[PDB]
Design an enzyme around this catalytic site. Structure first.
Site, PDB file in Angstrom:
ATOM      1  N   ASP A 186     -44.670  12.090   0.637  1.00  0.00           N
ATOM      2  CA  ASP A 186     -44.301  10.830  -0.390  1.00  0.00           C
ATOM      3  C   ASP A 186     -43.968   9.931   0.560  1.00  0.00           C
ATOM      4  O   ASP A 186     -42.799   9.878   1.063  1.00  0.00           O
ATOM      5  CB  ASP A 186     -43.371  11.162  -1.166  1.00  0.00           C
ATOM      6  CG  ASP A 186     -42.786  10.345  -2.222  1.00  0.00           C
ATOM      7  OD1 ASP A 186     -43.180   9.150  -2.069  1.00  0.00           O
ATOM      8  OD2 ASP A 186     -42.213  10.898  -3.236  1.00  0.00           O
ATOM      9  N   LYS A 217     -43.609   1.247  -4.718  1.00  0.00           N
ATOM     10  CA  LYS A 217     -42.776   0.503  -4.218  1.00  0.00           C
ATOM     11  C   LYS A 217     -43.198  -0.946  -3.794  1.00  0.00           C
ATOM     12  O   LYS A 217     -43.719  -1.640  -4.392  1.00  0.00           O
ATOM     13  CB  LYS A 217     -41.393   0.816  -3.225  1.00  0.00           C
ATOM     14  CG  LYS A 217     -40.721   1.974  -4.368  1.00  0.00           C
ATOM     15  CD  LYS A 217     -39.432   2.039  -3.668  1.00  0.00           C
ATOM     16  CE  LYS A 217     -38.502   2.723  -4.677  1.00  0.00           C
ATOM     17  NZ  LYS A 217     -38.270   4.248  -4.572  1.00  0.00           N
ATOM     18  N   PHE A 223     -36.347  12.887  -3.414  1.00  0.00           N
ATOM     19  CA  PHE A 223     -36.529  11.941  -4.356  1.00  0.00           C
ATOM     20  C   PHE A 223     -38.055  11.835  -4.779  1.00  0.00           C
ATOM     21  O   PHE A 223     -38.612  11.092  -3.792  1.00  0.00           O
ATOM     22  CB  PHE A 223     -35.660  10.656  -4.602  1.00  0.00           C
ATOM     23  CG  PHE A 223     -35.858   9.910  -5.818  1.00  0.00           C
ATOM     24  CD1 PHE A 223     -35.557  10.424  -7.041  1.00  0.00           C
ATOM     25  CD2 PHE A 223     -36.524   8.385  -5.699  1.00  0.00           C
ATOM     26  CE1 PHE A 223     -35.704   9.492  -8.131  1.00  0.00           C
ATOM     27  CE2 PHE A 223     -36.764   7.770  -6.827  1.00  0.00           C
ATOM     28  CZ  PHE A 223     -36.286   8.515  -8.027  1.00  0.00           C
TER      29      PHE A 223
END
Lengths: 391, 391
Positions: free
Chosen positions: B218, B247, B133
């Site tokens: 990532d 995040k 993702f």
């Protein structure tokens, strides 16, 4: 000092912006102060973002209150500020059909959401305008009509056809039954505050509706009441299928939105799109405060009044370097007779004014909506000398 | 009531998330309260974002201070918090070569920046992992390894090949002298906290280096010290070419970053990328406060210690539905012997705990790093009944 801050920038930042010529330390209303103590009247608002200037008490109160109540939760949970903000934006759009809202963090992300919406029509052809700016992410960059910003990143997502802005026949020829959507700015901001001919947006609405294409209006720069209506397209009495917002939506805090009307509002089904930070309480609370101040202080109507007197004042100068003034409300472009806009950007800075050379021959203004007429009057009185020095 | 809030959500929000089952009203630390007054222990942190929980005094102070000093300015101007944050992040990465920073607003936008970086290598072929993702904008969605989420928006930007996560020879077969970049999560979070075999990231670094491809890691979900090192890849002794963060970077406030090392740091030149809100003083000030608190309160080490104790305590239950626990620090997956994770999410909610069914058989935890040991102890003791009720 400014020298030390720029050296620190050049040591650590990527060079995708170049090196900023000035280092800002503080701001209050429409006046900012650099690290050397120089003050500037902000006629650019951080590129139309600081709708309420710096340190606005309503935004500060909303953000401080919400941070001491509930911060980020994600969309696994419902939270009041995002819901109320969606309700308020739907009311302001005033569409006749059901309107639904998706929140994100930026104008590029808002247009990415609209791009993905367009895919769910079952069509893959898109139409945008030469010189349009819609964002720098891979999808929004495909819609952007600026080849210098696109070419190094090809191939971009398809299939986009660009046409001349404001050309009705060109738009009618490009839109067909394979066109998923047309993207238009109601006034092209980044390219030089380019205002379309009267009737163009109504024509675009008719062309798209006849061909089954979505009309997507990018109001990231023209929205938030800047042109004297909350959405700039409301001056033309049309209702698009999709509207995107960002920049000033949060008064400075990062937030964007994609609004979809009628059948377009139902295309996104569970699991098909999302954004971790989208709709978070703190940023939504900031945007709710901005909407409240706009309404309570009548700043949308004020933007039209201030913008008319500013436009009149500039044209009344009769300066030979100015070809014409264009735009609407507090989005204004000073189009020049010669490519000296970057020079005029520097000499305005010497005079204590922050403006933007949007094109070699266009100076773009997007001041805070709380700006004083006196501060605008002072700029107009200073402008002959600014332009004289520019050459 | 919860019913009124959910009814308002369903009337205005796009349905890309479905309808949230609960509506949250307030939060403090690792405890959130819904609109009916029920409290929950937050073991998910709004999907790993709330690193310091809700209402952390250091974040509140940094944000309120900066809002009363200088808000959004845009990257036309240099401002202290973004420069300082870039300096701190480059220090924490500890690369041997020069590292440069680009700020944006989200994980998708950070990976879009890395995607565009990869174009500037002269190559257009990209490799990512099945089930990875990387975000939901058109560029990051092409990297995301989820055909069910990609198919409706095809065509996506190319040319991306997906391989099985953790498979060294599949990766080596897919990476060639035409590969611009390889994108990998150090642990695949959204798909179920999938941990790669020992040596895999090191093999990815060797494979990419030998073929002239960038290695992009990532760390949007695995970063911020959650796994017991600031970047999860630092457990493996490799230095990638690009690292992306979002995040928890802002403790709740929207901010992301793309870090590039060595030659990759020089690829982006003036005018080739940007983001209006990127690097803004308020979100950067929040992120700086998060870094200060992680360091001053030793929360990175605490994440490792508490993560080990938590994993051990869950496995000690000997519960027949629990196959194993995986992950590192405070990013944990409870892998189940049967697909009851969605039901366990609801029965955990009934017991007063917020968890995530990341896969049909995986419960994901990503609690705030300030979570109390007693709050974790209470969860472990409640888990047998939670799972019993789920079945």
């Amino acid at each position: 000092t400014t020298a030390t801050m720029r050296q620190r920038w050049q040591a650590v930042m990527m060079n995708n912006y170049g090196t900023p010529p000035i280092a800002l330390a503080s701001g209050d209303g429409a006046v900012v102060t650099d690290v050397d103590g120089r003050t500037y009247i902000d006629l650019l608002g951080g590129i139309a973002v600081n709708v309420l200037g710096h340190r606005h008490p309503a935004v500060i109160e909303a953000v401080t209150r919400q941070m001491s109540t509930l911060g980020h939760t994600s969309n696994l949970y419902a939270t009041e500020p995002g819901i109320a903000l969606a309700e308020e934006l739907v009311a302001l759009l005033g569409a006749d059909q059901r309107t639904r809202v998706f929140f994100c963090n930026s104008g590029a992300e808002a247009n990415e959401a609209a791009f993905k919406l367009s895919r769910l029509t079952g069509r893959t052809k898109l139409v945008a305008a030469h010189d349009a700016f819609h964002g720098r992410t891979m999808g929004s960059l495909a819609l952007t009509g600026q080849p210098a910003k696109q070419t190094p990143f090809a191939p971009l997502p398809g299939d986009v056809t660009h046409v001349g802005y404001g050309d009705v026949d060109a738009l009618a020829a490009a839109v067909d039954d394979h066109t998923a959507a047309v993207f238009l700015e109601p006034i092209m901001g980044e390219s030089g505050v380019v205002v379309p001919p009267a009737g163009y947006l109504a024509a675009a609405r008719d062309i798209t509706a006849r061909r089954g294409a979505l009309l997507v209006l990018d109001e990231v720069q023209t929205g938030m009441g800047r042109t004297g209506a909350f959405f700039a397209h409301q001056h033309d009495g049309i209702t698009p299928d999709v509207v995107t917002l960002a920049k000033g939506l949060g008064g400075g805090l990062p937030i964007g939105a994609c609004l979809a009307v009628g059948p377009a509002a139902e295309l996104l089904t569970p699991g098909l799109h999302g954004s971790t930070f989208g709709g978070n309480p703190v940023c939504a609370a900031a945007a709710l405060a901005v909407l409240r101040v706009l309404a309570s202080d009548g700043l949308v109507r004020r933007a039209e009044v201030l913008g008319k007197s500013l436009r009149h004042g500039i044209e009344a100068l009769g300066h030979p370097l100015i070809d014409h003034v264009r735009g609407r409300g507090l989005l204004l472009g000073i189009a020049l007779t010669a490519p000296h806009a970057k020079d005029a950007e520097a000499t305005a800075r010497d005079a204590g004014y922050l403006v933007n050379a949007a094109a070699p021959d266009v100076i773009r203004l997007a001041p805070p909506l709380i700006i004083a007429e006196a501060q605008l009057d002072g700029f107009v009185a200073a402008l002959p000398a600014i332009l004289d020095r520019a050459v």
